[PDB]
Design a protein around this ligand. Structure first.
Ligand code: MG
Ligand code: MG
Ligand code: MG
Ligand code: MG
Ligand code: MG
Ligand code: MG
Ligand code: MG
Ligand code: MG
Ligand code: MG
Ligand code: MG
Ligand code: MG
Ligand code: MG
Ligand code: MG
Ligand code: MG
Ligand code: MG
Ligand code: MG
Ligand code: MG
Ligand code: MG
Ligand code: MG
Ligand code: MG
Ligand code: MG
Ligand code: MG
Ligand code: MG
Ligand code: MG
Ligand code: MG
Ligand code: MG
Ligand code: MG
Ligand code: MG
Ligand code: MG
Ligand code: MG
Ligand code: MG
Ligand code: MG
Ligand code: MG
Ligand code: MG
Ligand code: MG
Ligand code: MG
Ligand code: MG
Ligand code: MG
Ligand code: MG
Ligand code: MG
Ligand code: MG
Ligand code: MG
Ligand code: MG
Ligand code: MG
Ligand code: MG
Ligand code: MG
Ligand code: MG
Ligand code: MG
Ligand code: MG
Ligand code: MG
Ligand code: MG
Ligand code: MG
Ligand code: MG
Ligand code: MG
Ligand code: MG
Ligand code: MG
Ligand code: MG
Ligand code: MG
Ligand code: MG
Ligand code: MG
Ligand code: MG
Ligand code: MG
Ligand code: MG
Ligand code: MG
Ligand code: MG
Ligand code: MG
Ligand code: MG
Ligand code: MG
Ligand code: MG
Ligand code: MG
Ligand code: MG
Lengths: 193, 148, 126, 207
RNA sequence: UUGACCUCAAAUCAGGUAGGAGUACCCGCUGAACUUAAGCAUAUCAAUAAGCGGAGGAAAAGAAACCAACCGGGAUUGCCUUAGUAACGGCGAGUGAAGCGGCAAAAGCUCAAAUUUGAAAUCUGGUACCUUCGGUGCCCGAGUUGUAAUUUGGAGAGGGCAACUUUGGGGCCGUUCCUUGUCUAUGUUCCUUGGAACAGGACGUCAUAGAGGGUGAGAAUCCCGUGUGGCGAGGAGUGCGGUUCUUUGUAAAGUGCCUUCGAAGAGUCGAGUUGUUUGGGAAUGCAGCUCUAAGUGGGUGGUAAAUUCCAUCUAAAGCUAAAUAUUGGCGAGAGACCGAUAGCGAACAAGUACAGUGAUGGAAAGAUGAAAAGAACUUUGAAAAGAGAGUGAAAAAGUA
RNA sequence: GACGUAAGUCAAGGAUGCUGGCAUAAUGGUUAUAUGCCGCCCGUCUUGAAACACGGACCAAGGAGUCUAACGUCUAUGCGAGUGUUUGGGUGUAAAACCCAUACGCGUAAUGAAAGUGAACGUAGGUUGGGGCCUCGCAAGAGGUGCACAAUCGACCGAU
RNA sequence: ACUAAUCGAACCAUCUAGUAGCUGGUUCCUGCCGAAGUUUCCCUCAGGAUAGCAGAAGCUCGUAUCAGUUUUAUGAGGUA
RNA sequence: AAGCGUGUUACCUAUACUCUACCGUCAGGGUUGAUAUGAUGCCCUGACGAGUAGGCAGGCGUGGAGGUCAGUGACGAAGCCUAGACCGUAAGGUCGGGUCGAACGGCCUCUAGUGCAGAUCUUGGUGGUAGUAGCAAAUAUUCAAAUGAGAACUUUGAAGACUGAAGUGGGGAAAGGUUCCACGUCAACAGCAGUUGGACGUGGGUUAGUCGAUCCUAAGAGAUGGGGAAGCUCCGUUUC
RNA sequence: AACCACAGCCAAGGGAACGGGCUUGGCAGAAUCAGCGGGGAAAGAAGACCCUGUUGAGCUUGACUCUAGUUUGACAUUGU
């Protein structure tokens, strides 16, 4: 029934919704179990650091490409540039992604610097050596944090060339909007006589 | 809590505040938005004009991220410089040392022109700007650098 | 207070465990303290009660009465002592059920296993 | 089951109440009204040496509490132990008793376990300071015993006029009135020189 | 005549395997109506209930014929969110995702397409002997209508030249996991009430133990326990010590450059049409029928079509832990929950007694006392029983 | 206020003075009864119920506006151009309490179907009121300023 | 007609607490305020929405703006 | 006239009017350098009080929760009874006395499965009706003895009757399941009674080569081969 | 056992327009038994007639919308 001045609602409760009500009573319990799972895995794989070294990538879309983040794995080009094989890299804790490609020199250099820097700060115990204890460090990510690069300097000189940035945006829109028609008129004008 | 509700006060009174004559029933006018064009027309035309009917174009597979463009006005432009370092630029207002404000890293797509910044030159890096916003920045002695 | 996650503080569970305790559990449940002299002699505080043990009643209406356990009647969590009885009106005599926590052991019926239990608990056994 | 059980409180407002309850611990009138036997306590806030943090045994911890003046509040607990007055007594809530002192340390070097068994006594790290223990039953003025390291650390934890709080972006709340002695403000010569003379405080009946 | 081969049979042939149960969660199929729309048919309820088939400790999904359009991400799942939004809809009622972003957890891979052809190098089985979750030899068989090695698109192969660097198994004991045992404080001191002290009062003690329970009334200190550590037993299986097997290898793997190559899944993709389904709208998936491909090819790029590009993946074959689920099972810990007409139907010989031909339906029913100490004995009565007496703190507790 | 020259007094902004009996069932309360007068059976639908309208033989126990998702107004509280710790992580005396990064949501911008564009002529305007404040006045009042708010004419952004 | 005391579609269980604009009921006390059965629309006429009547919260101000009233002046009306 | 018309006075009595008090509500005020510490306090002044549906406000009561009263309690908690008492307009609260036997309150707060006369309400218990309607079909009983506490009803004898061989007789089939028989025995059951009993308690009892089943086929039912069906399964009975 | 708000004398009045109760009169004396059918608008059942409901169902048909079956065509089976 429709009554006095109230916003129109859309409460989707016209199925047997009470049969699929999940109440996360176990939030604290699952937290205890997750920390217990982390401690168990830490002991099982000690002295390894509980997570793989991830690369830094750009985020997709125009909404998020201003930021960098952790990616899945280093590309085969990055691993080869860092001086090691993908198969060996996977056994010393480096994530390797065969489907990501390098087209950005800045990101590629950053990941290769990331790989050499990681190599400098790990100890690979020999397969039949003495294997000394090396104070297990739980987080590789906290050891090698992802840094947003520097876009510019804090201050510099005003260079005004009279370009009218707004005019530039307008003209960019117009040239793109009229490229197809102008090429069509160019092609027909060329073909006429 | 239950003890502060009118149910407690209605105890002993027969109709529970629902009336003897009207006699609270199940769904006397229909359920949900029933009758919005028939017996709820007046309410719907008075409080929700435009509710029924169609409007312009459809957009199949619309991703909002294509349209991400948070606006920032000039009157808030100087807030992107931290307060500790702000007053140093506000004084000694000159070129050859002008604050670069990267409004994109600040999370903004377009700089609008609500206006009245100080007369200090600033280098505004933005994806988009309104025509008046670029006028006021240039008038102050700054510049807008188009970035992507 | 409680510290471990394996032990319960739930009253209903505790009482259920008590009243459904099997006989071998009830043997431990029916422990009695030793007398001052027996504590000094052996070095142990309390032992599970047994048949030929000599006991002194130290609570209730039969306080100060001595005797020997004629029965550890585990089915109702009690022990019966000879010389401690109720004389019914029809001349008959019936045992008084006693709880061993209200008893004091004044002499032990010692065999190999009782001696080993004392030594296990840290007893002098002399 | 999907009845609302937990209640979200604004984090700043939780801190607001915690600070108000810490401040109320220093007001002997509030602590007396709340029910603690601090009538013979030499001074409130009660601060004791940091050696309390390293006391290992319950007996030594109890003796230190009695020495610093918590004996009556300890005896009030375990003299107040009562059987609960209804069905709660067979839902594992059999007994009731008063709260004793709350000992606040900075480093648990044995004090927590030494006081675990003392009836009515609680312990807390300065870093946490539960409101449920500082104002039990929503009643302000819990009898608190601070160790010296705990008292000193409290400026770093909650901030001061010269020290920023360790809590990110937090500052202690501001008073909306400069004092609580409205009588003394009224009696100030400034207001006294602006007010008209007063009547009788009980008007004489006419007609 | 005989000996194969193919195909098809028989045997109480040798050895195995499936069925049925449970089913809370999981993978599918099939599939409603009540209901809402203030009527009603599309719609909604709902791709739900019921019905059928199949699993496990999880299942399924899963290492892109993905998302994207960015300066690009990068298996799957789940959470926060996107978002009650794009979209669908008698555009009514209603319905309704996904990409990005932050998190939990992270793990990668395997076949088919290739001549071993200087050697079927491969495997089940029988048998004998052993160090028996198997090994070795011998034999029969399977298999060239293709079993091994070698490659899986990230590649990789053949050849040519360079060279260097790293390797396996196996006991005991160790830890580690599970199951379980045992040991490890302190009053039963005096006074009062009481049937009973576990109550109140006094004086103490232990406390990493003042959780809980029992004991003749509220028991840290009477008992079991609790807390804290110690010492054992049976058993799991990976990092640990250490001990040997020490041509234990010209055996395997990796790495650079050059050259030539680089096989990559068909009644399938795709299309038309019908039905169903989806937010998917000139058609989201699925399924039937008809048509039916290619190899700088093929799919996708959320408005049908032609022409031109571009981007992005590589289907029609396959395996994989964790984060997720769990009104069933087993083992535990709990509660501002109910307190015998409540709480499960069932606190009890409860899915019992009982009803119905049957499918099914399905209750009621807890409390003497601390202890039967459950009333000896006398007397009236044919007896039940009464009156006495007696037990008990109390019979104003007598199993009615 | 009155009276009196004054003392002081008075019937003048609400009772004092004198005296007696009893100190208990005596007054009073409770209860049963009697007497006078009055009083139809509740609940419910209904214009209208004591109704020849319905439910109700009696008693005990049970017995009906709840919780949840999303939301409107109002109110309290915290912070404030911000705000929200609790998805998750850290930590714990362990479902508590305490601490926290990156995001995300809502707000800080609107408007158009959309492509898009996007907020100061001015002391962020003028006029009429406008509480409070200021100046002058014994005061009344007069003059200056005038936040919120109200009416109104403009200016700016988008659509046309 | 009969199909297990059941037949103009048996019985059992579930969907299912099926929907009901209709009938019945809807549990303490006191205090203050205090109605409507009319307008418009509706497959509307035993129902709703809407406005009105009502309460509550107040807020901006502080004797104004006013007024179910008259007087004066000035209109209008076509009933007796 | 105690009737009708009319006139005059006196008189009667409403929860209305005047005055006074008390309650509450609203309004307007007073009160701080001791308001001679209650400032949501105290006090002054005026007016007002009907009420269904309904709104709001302040309170009363119940189960559980945090805190406090170092509250009460086996020398008696709670519960229940009490034409005994007191406080509150009221919801209610308190006290005494009896019964009783183990727990329970006051205050500040939190929370709800939180208050009953009704629902042809649910479950259970109980009345009036009422010692009432009734216990009247099947022709019918009687005498004596025995037994027994007790005999219309048991047993025995005597007698009078009836079923009248398509039986109230002698066996069986379905069904029941020990009811059969003996001893003991009468609280319940046998709508009176009961010493009797198909009742209660404890026992005893069913013997087959030939009687039946078992074998046969009947109308039918139904595997297999095989074909349908997503499938549960269906078809079919000698078929390919 | 039905039944039972409480109950049980009338007349008239008014009253929801036929009262056991209310108003005015009549009157009115414990406790009861057999019978009786005037009254209790006696009991038996949420009128089965009628109307209303945006409540059904059985049945009918040129109602609306479909559907098993069946018929017709094309494609496939489908070759020489
Ligand atoms: Mg009312
Ligand atoms: Mg009603
Ligand atoms: Mg109670
Ligand atoms: Mg599935
Ligand atoms: Mg409908
Ligand atoms: Mg409807
Ligand atoms: Mg219908
Ligand atoms: Mg659907
Ligand atoms: Mg199902
Ligand atoms: Mg299994
Ligand atoms: Mg798992
Ligand atoms: Mg799989
Ligand atoms: Mg691949
Ligand atoms: Mg992914
Ligand atoms: Mg959003
Ligand atoms: Mg569609
Ligand atoms: Mg749907
Ligand atoms: Mg190889
Ligand atoms: Mg006890
Ligand atoms: Mg004691
Ligand atoms: Mg202990
Ligand atoms: Mg392929
Ligand atoms: Mg389907
Ligand atoms: Mg569909
Ligand atoms: Mg890509
Ligand atoms: Mg029950
Ligand atoms: Mg008694
Ligand atoms: Mg009694
Ligand atoms: Mg008794
Ligand atoms: Mg009297
Ligand atoms: Mg009367
Ligand atoms: Mg009527
Ligand atoms: Mg009535
Ligand atoms: Mg009716
Ligand atoms: Mg009735
Ligand atoms: Mg009834
Ligand atoms: Mg009740
Ligand atoms: Mg129903
Ligand atoms: Mg009024
Ligand atoms: Mg219409
Ligand atoms: Mg009606
Ligand atoms: Mg005329
Ligand atoms: Mg006219
Ligand atoms: Mg006259
Ligand atoms: Mg009133
Ligand atoms: Mg309570
Ligand atoms: Mg009592
Ligand atoms: Mg009474
Ligand atoms: Mg008792
Ligand atoms: Mg209730
Ligand atoms: Mg009742
Ligand atoms: Mg009522
Ligand atoms: Mg009779
Ligand atoms: Mg004859
Ligand atoms: Mg005859
Ligand atoms: Mg016979
Ligand atoms: Mg028998
Ligand atoms: Mg009889
Ligand atoms: Mg008899
Ligand atoms: Mg006999
Ligand atoms: Mg017989
Ligand atoms: Mg009644
Ligand atoms: Mg009556
Ligand atoms: Mg009548
Ligand atoms: Mg009357
Ligand atoms: Mg009369
Ligand atoms: Mg009659
Ligand atoms: Mg009817
Ligand atoms: Mg009917
Ligand atoms: Mg209608
Ligand atoms: Mg019909």
């Amino acid at each position: 029934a429709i009554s006095k001045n109230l916003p129109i609602l859309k409460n989707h409760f016209r199925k047997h919704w009470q049969e699929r009500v999940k109440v996360h009573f176990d939030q604290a319990g699952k937290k205890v179990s997750r920390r217990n799972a982390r401690a168990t895995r830490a002991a099982k794989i000690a002295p390894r650091p509980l997570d793989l070294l991830r690369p830094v990538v750009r985020a997709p879309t125009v909404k998020y490409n201003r930021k960098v983040r952790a990616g899945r794995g280093f590309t085969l080009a990055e691993v080869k540039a860092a001086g090691l094989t993908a198969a060996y890299a996977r056994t010393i804790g480096i994530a390797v992604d065969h489907r990501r490609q390098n087209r950005n020199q800045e990101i590629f250099d950053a990941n290769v610097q990331r790989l050499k820097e990681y190599q400098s700060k790990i100890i690979v115990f020999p397969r039949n050596g003495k294997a000394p204890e090396a104070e297990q460090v739980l987080s590789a990510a906290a050891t090698f944090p992802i840094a947003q690069p520097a876009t510019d300097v804090e201050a510099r000189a005003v260079q005004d060339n009279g370009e009218s940035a707004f005019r530039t945006l307008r003209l960019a829109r117009s040239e793109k909007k009229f490229r197809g028609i102008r090429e069509k008129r160019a092609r027909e004008k060329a073909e006429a006589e | 809590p239950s003890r502060f509700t009118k149910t407690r006060k209605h105890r002993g009174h027969v109709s529970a505040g629902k009336g003897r004559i009207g006699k609270h029933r199940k769904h006397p006018g229909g359920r949900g938005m029933a009758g919005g064009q028939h017996h709820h027309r007046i309410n719907m035309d008075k409080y929700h004009p435009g509710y029924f009917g169609k409007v312009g174009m459809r957009y199949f597979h619309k991703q909002q991220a294509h349209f991400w463009k948070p606006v920032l006005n000039l009157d808030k432009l100087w807030t992107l410089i931290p307060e500790d370092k702000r007053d140093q630029y506000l004084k000694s207002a000159s070129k050859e040392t002008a604050p670069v404000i990267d409004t994109l890293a600040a999370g903004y797509g377009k700089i609008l022109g609500k206006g009245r910044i100080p007369n200090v030159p600033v280098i505004v890096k933005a994806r988009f700007v309104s025509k008046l916003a670029e006028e006021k920045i240039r008038a102050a002695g700054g510049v807008v650098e188009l970035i992507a | 207070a409680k510290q471990s996650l394996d032990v319960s503080s739930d009253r209903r569970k505790a009482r259920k465990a008590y009243f459904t305790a099997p006989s071998s559990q009830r043997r431990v449940l029916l422990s009695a303290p030793l007398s001052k002299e027996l504590r000094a002699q052996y070095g142990i505080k309390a032992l599970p009660i047994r048949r030929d043990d000599e006991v002194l009643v130290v609570r209730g209406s039969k306080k100060g009465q001595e005797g020997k356990i004629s029965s550890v009647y585990r089915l109702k969590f009690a022990v019966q002592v000879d010389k401690v009885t109720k004389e019914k009106v029809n001349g008959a005599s019936v045992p008084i059920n006693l709880h061993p926590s209200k008893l004091v052991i004044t002499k032990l019926h010692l065999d190999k296993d009782r001696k080993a239990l004392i030594q296990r608990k840290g007893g002098k056994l002399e | 089951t999907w009845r609302k059980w937990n209640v979200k409180v604004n984090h700043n407002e939780k801190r607001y109440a915690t600070a108000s309850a810490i401040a109320a611990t220093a007001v002997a009138s509030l602590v007396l009204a709340r029910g603690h036997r601090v009538e013979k306590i030499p001074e409130i806030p009660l601060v004791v040496s940091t050696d309390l943090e390293s006391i290992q045994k319950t007996k030594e911890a109890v003796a230190a509490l009695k020495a610093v003046g918590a004996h009556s509040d300890l005896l009030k607990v375990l003299k107040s132990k009562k059987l609960r007055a209804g069905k709660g007594k067979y839902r594992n809530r059999r007994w009731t008793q008063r709260r004793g002192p709350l000992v606040v340390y900075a480093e648990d070097n044995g004090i927590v376990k030494a006081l675990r068994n003392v009836p009515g006594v609680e312990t807390a790290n300065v870093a946490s300071l539960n409101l449920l223990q500082l104002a039990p039953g929503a009643h302000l003025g819990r009898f608190v015993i601070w160790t010296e390291a705990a008292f000193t650390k409290l400026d770093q934890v909650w901030g001061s006029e010269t020290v920023a709080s360790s809590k990110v972006g937090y500052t202690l709340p501001s008073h909306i009135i400069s004092t609580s002695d409205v009588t003394r403000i009224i009696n100030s010569s400034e207001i006294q020189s602006a007010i008209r003379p007063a009547g009788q405080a009980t008007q004489k009946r006419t007609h």
